[PDB]
């Protein structure tokens, strides 16, 4: 596949959809999902959420030029705001010249929390749970035989205590669960429910919340990009000077939360529209992202920007990225399935990897524009 | 208006729509925008973003039962996830019994940052800016006379310094701008650009970034709700026990970021779909929400939950809420305009107030379900 899509931005929507079809070998039926409005049947919309009275459209676009670990990919995006898809495409174009985006990711591990109140000896109870870890993990893994058969399941437990609470001490067990190609919520919630009685028995507390964490910091995805000064030269500024301007803008984000919130918002302009295009939950991705940004005690930048020893601009993005290829709208929305076809992803973690590449590209594009805009006279 | 809509959840989409239309006195042609696919035509979609190949639908729903400062409202919501709209509607139902949601908000004030580098005396240069603040403010306000006539404009400046970074000394001025019924990005960015040469002249420094902040902590919206124990009683649990269980859940969110992230995610399940329904930028709302939640130095809960001196459960939500009736895609998308017509909102801050009410209801619904599951 060649994702360069020459002249794409200036073709008609019909021509763009043709050129996509050719590259991919899309079927007639697949292309027809965009012949006309109303690809989401009302019977499916009505089954998705409650109190449905119709549907609401956003534009559906494809960013060009992306390359992930040497392989070109086409990226579908759904959003209302201008400049995003262009910026993504242009920064991907520049990235290609230097090897494109390089990505990696964790296993698809999610936390399930089990909160236990009213224990007199929570610190001791924590060790009683840890002594009985294998029993808890076995129980967690009893029911979902499809998940187990696919190579997922509860791998481990950790237990945390919060001594200092206006509502008494709490103990919080986390099941660590490999959820394969799902986002994970229903999978891990179900496990948390199943193990709760046993935990109660072991600790003598009352179980309260049994619930996933959206701070999915064992489900990380990672992207790298490199840009050379020659690529960043403008009519006004040397590429070297633009690189120094981008580093200055990164440092500003890193120290000032008022800057970091906006900087990170620009990452999410890249990521969220891919989450929407694939029928995935963008509130989960948002929460994970921003809570991770402040894990240090200070709300900072999710990306990093540096200059390497050759003077090249190098950027990273590592962050939680819980997404699915299965579940809910990702399965039932015909255009979420189309999006997955367009992407070519074979695992949820491959989707996550593309997500962070396009977040990284978006932040780069935003920073580049802000760094190179002349001052008025 | 009566927002109760009994058996709404069991009507067909067509019957629900016809009921809304009759309630609101929508025109045939307005109803037709939801009764048929394709209210966003391709020539509009193609002009909205780049590299367009089609459109992508989500369901468009209406939550029932909401009441805001004593006035019933209907709330459009666009999202993919089940349980949200039902929970919003059911928690609104319970709220109504005790006066509904009570809301307030600040003026629609947004920050415009202007970053200055290249000077060895940033702390001094700050005072130079402050000494000439009226000149800066007047220059900002020359750039948008209409906004000033609409009752907005640059009100003030604040200036912050970062004398020791790994990239050298920085100074950051903030324009503080009342943006009336806009989200405010383009409005404040334009002012930031306009004042940049004057700030260079004053400081001797070089202006780098000119850009809004999404941490919109001078644009707050507030909601309150009250729930009694009789309303929360289940077959398994006394309502008093449920209230204690919700207070336990809250304290857990307040101490553990792993829990707070999820707790706040539930709030945004309620808010973001209204932001989408109104053609607003949900990334901006998300960034403001989560960055605000960690302004203390610890990422905590956006809501609060307490028991008052009658034993009632009382909840709050106060947070940044930058949204528009104008600007961006609020005006471009025909269904964004219809959503605003359904809501009846006459200012952006009124929309913000509904947003926090819905977020508060959603969090309540989530916690109630988590506290009552055997
Ligand atoms: C341009 C930006 O504000 C996003 C606009 O939607 C991001 C940033 O400031 O880096
Ligand atoms: C139920 C919840 O996880 C949202 C599900 O989308 C929120 C919460 O845990 O409070
Ligand atoms: O290869 N790192 O996941």
From Swiss-Prot, chain A:
EC no.? 1.1.1.88
Recount the UniProt induction comment for this entry. Answer: Coinduction with mevalonate transport system.
Lineage, top-rank taxon, reads Bacteria
The membrane spanning regions, by residue number, are: none
Q: Tell me one GO molecular function of this protein.
A: hydroxymethylglutaryl-CoA reductase (NADH) activity
Name of a matching Pfam family: HMG-CoA_red
Supply the alphabetized keyword list: NAD, Oxidoreductase
InterPro entries recorded for this chain? HMG_CoA_Rdtase, HMG_CoA_Rdtase_bac-typ, HMG_CoA_Rdtase_cat_sf, HMG_CoA_Rdtase_CS, HMG_CoA_Rdtase_NAD(P)-bd_sf, HMG_CoA_Rdtase_sub-bd_dom_sf
Kindly list the biological process annotations in GO that this record carries: coenzyme A metabolic process
Reactions catalysed, semicolon-separated, are: (R)-mevalonate + 2 NAD(+) + CoA = (3S)-3-hydroxy-3-methylglutaryl-CoA + 2 NADH + 2 H(+)
Quote the annotated effect of residue 50 to Q: No loss of activity
Q: Check the record and name the CDD domains matching this protein.
A: HMG-CoA_reductase_classII
Swapping residue 181 to A/N leads to an effect described as: Reduced activity
Q: What pathway, per the record?
A: Metabolic intermediate metabolism; (R)-mevalonate degradation; (S)-3-hydroxy-3-methylglutaryl-CoA from (R)-mevalonate: step 1/1
Outline what the protein does. Answer: P.mevalonii can use mevalonate as sole carbon source. With this enzyme mevalonate is deacetylated to HMG-CoA.
The similarity comment for this entry is:
Belongs to the HMG-CoA reductase family.
What the entry lists under NCBIfam families is as follows:
HMG_CoA_R_NAD (TIGR00532)
Protein name stated in the entry: 3-hydroxy-3-methylglutaryl-coenzyme A reductase
Where does this protein come from, organism-wise?
Pseudomonas mevalonii
Its taxonomic placement starts with: Bacteria, Pseudomonadati, Pseudomonadota, Gammaproteobacteria, Pseudomonadales
Swiss-Prot record, chain B:
Keyword Oxidoreductase in record: yes
Please give the superkingdom of this protein's source.
Answer: Bacteria
Gene3D superfamilies xrefs: 1.10.8.660, 3-hydroxy-3-methylglutaryl-coenzyme A Reductase, Chain A, domain 2
Q: What induces it?
A: Coinduction with mevalonate transport system.
* Pfam families found in the cross-reference section: HMG-CoA_red
Which E.C. number(s) belong to this protein? 1.1.1.88
NCBIfam families per the UniProt record, alphabetical: HMG_CoA_R_NAD (TIGR00532)
Pathway membership: Metabolic intermediate metabolism; (R)-mevalonate degradation; (S)-3-hydroxy-3-methylglutaryl-CoA from (R)-mevalonate: step 1/1
Consequence of mutating residue 81 to Q?
Answer: Greatly reduced activity
Q: Name one GO biological process term.
A: coenzyme A metabolic process
Record's subunit section: Homotetramer.
Which protein is depicted?
Answer: 3-hydroxy-3-methylglutaryl-coenzyme A reductase
Recorded hits in CDD domains, A to Z, give:
HMG-CoA_reductase_classII
Give the keywords, sorted: NAD, Oxidoreductase
Q: Which gene encodes it?
A: mvaA
Purpose of the protein: P.mevalonii can use mevalonate as sole carbon source. With this enzyme mevalonate is deacetylated to HMG-CoA.
